[PDB]
Amino acid sequence: EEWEELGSGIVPSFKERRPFHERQKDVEEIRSQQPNKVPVIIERFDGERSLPLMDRCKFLVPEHITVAELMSIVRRRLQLHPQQAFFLLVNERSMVSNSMSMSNLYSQERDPDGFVYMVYTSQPAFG
Ligand SMILES: [Mg+2]
């Protein structure tokens, strides 16, 4: 009569893995060390079946980098067919390949814990 664990195979996300205060401390220290860099969490969308997983979810992006530029990097890193559909969301909102800096994105979209959370999908918003 011993407790058997279930669901070892279901990977938790970053927020599920680490507590708020422990996440908040990571951003505090990193911002002090490298203040010209933006903390980002980039994970796969839950339902997603086409696009692959990456080994890392914690990332540092220089302030000057563009949203368009970040999408190309994330797209390149996953090694996809060029026709394959790729979208990158912040707070469940799709992003256009636009000219805005990571520092402007960070100001506008940061989570209370200090990270910006992004998720990548094959599913388009509309259509
Ligand atoms: Mg889950």
UniProtKB/Swiss-Prot annotation:
Q: Name one Pfam family in it.
A: ATG8
Gene disruption: observed consequences? Viable with no visible defects in development or fertility. Embryos contain an increased number of endosomes. Lysosomes have a reduced capacity to interact with autophagosomes in embryos and furthermore, there is defective autophagosome degradation with an accumulation of lgg-1-positive autophagosomes in 500-cell embryos. Double knockout with rab-7 partially rescues the defective lgg-1- and lgg-2-positive autophagosome degradation defect in the individual rab-7 and lgg-2 single mutants.
Which interval of the chain is the signal sequence?
none
Q: Where is the lipid attached (Phosphatidylethanolamine amidated glycine)?
A: 127
One of the GO biological process terms: defense response to Gram-positive bacterium
Keyword ATP-binding in the entry? The reply is: no
Which protein family is it in?
Answer: Belongs to the ATG8 family.
Q: What does the subunit comment say? A: May interact with vps-39. Interacts with lgg-3; the interaction is direct. Interacts with atg-16.1 (via WD domain) and atg-16.2 (via WD 5-6 repeats); the interactions are direct. Interacts with sepa-1 (via the LIR motifs); the interaction is direct. Interacts with sqst-1 (via the LIR motifs); the interaction is direct. Interacts with epg-2 (via the LIR motifs); the interaction is weak. Interacts with atg-7; the interaction is direct. Interacts with atg-3. The interaction with atg-7 and atg-3 may be required for the lipidation of lgg-2.
Q: What is this protein called?
A: Protein lgg-2
Q: Which gene encodes it?
A: lgg-2
